[PDB]
Amino acid sequence: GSSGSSGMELTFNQAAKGVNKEFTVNIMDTCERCNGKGNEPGTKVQHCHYCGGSGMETINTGPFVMRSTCRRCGGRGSIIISPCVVCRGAGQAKQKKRSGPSSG
Ligand SMILES: [Zn+2]
Ligand SMILES: [Zn+2]
What we know:
This is DnaJ homolog subfamily A member 3, mitochondrial. The chain is mostly beta strands. Helix content is 0%, strand content 19%. The protein has strands at 29-30, 46-47, 56-61, 64-69, 78-79, 92-93. It starts with 28 loop residues before the first strand and ends in an 11-residue tail after the last strand. It binds zinc ion (ZN) (2 copies). One zinc ion is lined by residues 31, 33-34, 84, 86-87.
């Protein structure tokens, strides 16, 4: 076997532009213990007043006011007596995956 012609018909050297190669080694997926909730699967939760279920807090200082994400709940709308032990209330963790089917 031997050859060496040209044509430049199609391009099948690299993959699409969107799907960047080696995006990021580290793997981040939705927690499993809390299922992307941020609390222990064996604990209860309390209603937050600061935001009132909106996850938004307001800082009234003088003739002006500021706006920052609730601190008591953390922009959730409720107080987690016991925050997850895997994601520590992050909503995502490291899920060792090989393929990782986006759609599904
Ligand atoms: Zn709150
Ligand atoms: Zn978790």
